[PDB]
Design a protein around this motif. Sequence first.
Motif, PDB file in Angstrom:
ATOM      1  N   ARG A 110       0.861  -1.175   0.000  1.00  0.00           N
ATOM      2  CA  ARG A 110       0.000   0.000   0.000  1.00  0.00           C
ATOM      3  C   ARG A 110       0.914   1.248   0.000  1.00  0.00           C
ATOM      4  O   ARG A 110       1.612   1.542   0.980  1.00  0.00           O
ATOM      5  N   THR A 111       0.908   1.960  -1.122  1.00  0.00           N
ATOM      6  CA  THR A 111       1.745   3.147  -1.335  1.00  0.00           C
ATOM      7  C   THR A 111       1.164   4.499  -0.917  1.00  0.00           C
ATOM      8  O   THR A 111      -0.018   4.623  -0.563  1.00  0.00           O
ATOM      9  N   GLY A 112       2.016   5.515  -0.978  1.00  0.00           N
ATOM     10  CA  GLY A 112       1.586   6.855  -0.651  1.00  0.00           C
ATOM     11  C   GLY A 112       0.493   7.274  -1.614  1.00  0.00           C
ATOM     12  O   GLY A 112      -0.462   7.949  -1.220  1.00  0.00           O
ATOM     13  N   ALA A 113       0.631   6.862  -2.875  1.00  0.00           N
ATOM     14  CA  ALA A 113      -0.343   7.170  -3.916  1.00  0.00           C
ATOM     15  C   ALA A 113      -1.688   6.575  -3.520  1.00  0.00           C
ATOM     16  O   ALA A 113      -2.730   7.194  -3.712  1.00  0.00           O
ATOM     17  N   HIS A 114      -1.652   5.360  -2.983  1.00  0.00           N
ATOM     18  CA  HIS A 114      -2.861   4.680  -2.529  1.00  0.00           C
ATOM     19  C   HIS A 114      -3.522   5.488  -1.422  1.00  0.00           C
ATOM     20  O   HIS A 114      -4.727   5.755  -1.467  1.00  0.00           O
ATOM     21  N   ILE A 115      -2.726   5.886  -0.432  1.00  0.00           N
ATOM     22  CA  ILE A 115      -3.263   6.643   0.681  1.00  0.00           C
ATOM     23  C   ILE A 115      -3.897   7.948   0.198  1.00  0.00           C
ATOM     24  O   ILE A 115      -5.029   8.290   0.570  1.00  0.00           O
ATOM     25  N   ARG A 116      -3.167   8.664  -0.648  1.00  0.00           N
ATOM     26  CA  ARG A 116      -3.645   9.934  -1.172  1.00  0.00           C
ATOM     27  C   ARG A 116      -4.975   9.787  -1.922  1.00  0.00           C
ATOM     28  O   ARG A 116      -5.918  10.559  -1.715  1.00  0.00           O
ATOM     29  N   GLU A 117      -5.068   8.781  -2.780  1.00  0.00           N
ATOM     30  CA  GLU A 117      -6.295   8.583  -3.522  1.00  0.00           C
ATOM     31  C   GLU A 117      -7.433   8.229  -2.569  1.00  0.00           C
ATOM     32  O   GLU A 117      -8.556   8.714  -2.736  1.00  0.00           O
ATOM     33  N   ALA A 118      -7.137   7.394  -1.574  1.00  0.00           N
ATOM     34  CA  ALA A 118      -8.137   6.994  -0.600  1.00  0.00           C
ATOM     35  C   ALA A 118      -8.604   8.216   0.175  1.00  0.00           C
ATOM     36  O   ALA A 118      -9.760   8.284   0.596  1.00  0.00           O
ATOM     37  N   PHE A 119      -7.701   9.183   0.350  1.00  0.00           N
ATOM     38  CA  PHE A 119      -8.019  10.408   1.080  1.00  0.00           C
ATOM     39  C   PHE A 119      -8.958  11.320   0.318  1.00  0.00           C
ATOM     40  O   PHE A 119      -9.760  12.026   0.925  1.00  0.00           O
ATOM     41  N   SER A 120      -8.871  11.313  -1.009  1.00  0.00           N
ATOM     42  CA  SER A 120      -9.733  12.179  -1.813  1.00  0.00           C
ATOM     43  C   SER A 120     -11.195  11.775  -1.679  1.00  0.00           C
ATOM     44  O   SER A 120     -12.093  12.538  -2.041  1.00  0.00           O
ATOM     45  N   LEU A 121     -11.431  10.575  -1.159  1.00  0.00           N
ATOM     46  CA  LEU A 121     -12.783  10.066  -0.965  1.00  0.00           C
ATOM     47  C   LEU A 121     -13.397  10.512   0.370  1.00  0.00           C
ATOM     48  O   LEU A 121     -14.619  10.506   0.535  1.00  0.00           O
ATOM     49  N   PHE A 122     -12.556  10.901   1.325  1.00  0.00           N
ATOM     50  CA  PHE A 122     -13.072  11.323   2.625  1.00  0.00           C
ATOM     51  C   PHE A 122     -13.895  12.595   2.531  1.00  0.00           C
ATOM     52  O   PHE A 122     -13.418  13.615   2.047  1.00  0.00           O
ATOM     53  N   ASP A 123     -15.130  12.524   3.015  1.00  0.00           N
ATOM     54  CA  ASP A 123     -16.032  13.670   3.001  1.00  0.00           C
ATOM     55  C   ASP A 123     -15.990  14.422   4.341  1.00  0.00           C
ATOM     56  O   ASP A 123     -16.504  13.929   5.358  1.00  0.00           O
ATOM     57  N   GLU A 124     -15.397  15.614   4.333  1.00  0.00           N
ATOM     58  CA  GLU A 124     -15.278  16.423   5.542  1.00  0.00           C
ATOM     59  C   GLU A 124     -16.622  16.743   6.203  1.00  0.00           C
ATOM     60  O   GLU A 124     -16.704  16.845   7.430  1.00  0.00           O
ATOM     61  N   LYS A 125     -17.670  16.907   5.397  1.00  0.00           N
ATOM     62  CA  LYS A 125     -18.982  17.245   5.943  1.00  0.00           C
ATOM     63  C   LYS A 125     -19.732  16.049   6.506  1.00  0.00           C
ATOM     64  O   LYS A 125     -20.321  16.132   7.579  1.00  0.00           O
ATOM     65  N   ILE A 126     -19.708  14.932   5.791  1.00  0.00           N
ATOM     66  CA  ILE A 126     -20.427  13.754   6.242  1.00  0.00           C
ATOM     67  C   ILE A 126     -19.642  12.927   7.256  1.00  0.00           C
ATOM     68  O   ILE A 126     -20.233  12.302   8.143  1.00  0.00           O
ATOM     69  N   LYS A 127     -18.318  12.931   7.116  1.00  0.00           N
ATOM     70  CA  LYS A 127     -17.410  12.241   8.032  1.00  0.00           C
ATOM     71  C   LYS A 127     -17.525  10.719   8.152  1.00  0.00           C
ATOM     72  O   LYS A 127     -17.233  10.153   9.202  1.00  0.00           O
TER      73      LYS A 127
END
Lengths: 221, 225
Positions: A110-127
């Motif tokens: 699991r790479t940094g690229a993986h983490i970053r892409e997974a992070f773009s999915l996190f919704d700050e409003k819905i959490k």
Amino acid sequence: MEKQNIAVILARQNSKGLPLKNLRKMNGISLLGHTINAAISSKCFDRIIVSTDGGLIAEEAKNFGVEVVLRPAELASDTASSISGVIHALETIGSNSGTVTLLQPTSPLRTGAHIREAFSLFDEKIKGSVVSACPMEHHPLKTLLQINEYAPMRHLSDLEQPRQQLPQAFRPNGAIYINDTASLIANNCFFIAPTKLYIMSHQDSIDIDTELDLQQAENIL
Amino acid sequence: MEKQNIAVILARQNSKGLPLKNLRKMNGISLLGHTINAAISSKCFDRIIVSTDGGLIAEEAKNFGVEVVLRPAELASDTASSISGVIHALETIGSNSGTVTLLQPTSPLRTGAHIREAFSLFDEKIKGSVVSACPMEHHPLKTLLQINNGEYAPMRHLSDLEQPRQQLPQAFRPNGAIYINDTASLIANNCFFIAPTKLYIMSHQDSIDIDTELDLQQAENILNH
Ligand SMILES: Nc1ccn([C@@H]2O[C@H](COP(=O)(O)OP(=O)(O)O)[C@@H](O)[C@H]2O)c(=O)n1
Ligand SMILES: Nc1ccn([C@@H]2O[C@H](COP(=O)(O)OP(=O)(O)O)[C@@H](O)[C@H]2O)c(=O)n1
């Protein structure tokens, strides 16, 4: 308190299977090192914490330029929940706002690229949580559970239905669990609705547990 | 019509996976032969039928002393369901009463004894299915299903995802080796799973399915043990 995106890498020194597993080398870099490098190269975190019970893990983490939290033996036993591990880490550094991501060293591909892409999915409003997952070889709807004697997961017809007619099935792979910090503390668990998934291939989802897994993953490189 | 226990072995000649798969030998005996042997040695059937579309398969089946049913191209196509193949086998021989059992040649490690044990679970009063299954490596409750492109939902409870395996109901999946049904029920329901379905548990090792050259080696290795 300003919000912080925190990475928590639980790396206790002893392991049921492979001894000193978290320090086992893969391409000359320890499992811990690989996950630490993923956290750093992702650039998604303000703080990266390695939580452990042993001096050998601690020394390795420090060499990698990240923070170390020393866990009491009780929180590093075979019966110690990972959630209690992450809670202790957040309390130790005094953080309760932002995001906290659990990154296990047992998922070295699991790479940094993986983490970053997974992070773009996190919704700050819905959490809701963002959990990495991979496709299932055997479809979970085509199974039966013992009740005493067995009953289908859903319908009997499902057992005779071809994949294409059934929903896409995925299982968490343990590589990444991203959550809103306050929510994880309040819920005391890693899965918080509405949970979203980050899909990873079977290859990159490899989880180190045995000596074989180590070689296999060392080849995929 | 008197009741008869029928075994149906669907074995199309061609395979887009492993060429002429059903005729491939494993320790001197074709995959088809291993399954016929298991059906014979089980002593559970009055009749053993091998349903196929090819001459090489038919010839092989005949050498084992069993019956052969010839399937139309449409029932042997890549989309043809196994149930339609079994229905066709029963219609061809004219049996509509007793029990019918599907025994796939792709499960060479499923033996005559396995079959015998599975039959001991069949209840001729209740008439529910008896299907061989094996344990799952990954618990099926610890999954989520895709709903809309980028939206998913847990199989059951979101909390199940974090639940320790030991605290979750034991899960099993059919292995494709054995499906035993009351014949009348199978014909009326037009499916292999009829309530109440009983499971005959088999190990992962004996549940090996043959899909690739590697599976075949693994199967020979397990036997050569
Ligand atoms: N209480 C715990 C439990 C697991 N872990 C770590 O979390 C990772 C995953 O643990 P695991 O036992 O599920 O590893 P596998 O059995 O999946 O191979 C390892 O690096 C463990 O040392 C921990 O630091 N503290
Ligand atoms: N309609 C069907 C379906 C499966 N089968 C047989 O059932 C076994 C399992 O099916 P399979 O899908 O793995 O066979 P392949 O299509 O992969 O070659 C093989 O021995 C097939 O030849 C059949 O004869 N007719």
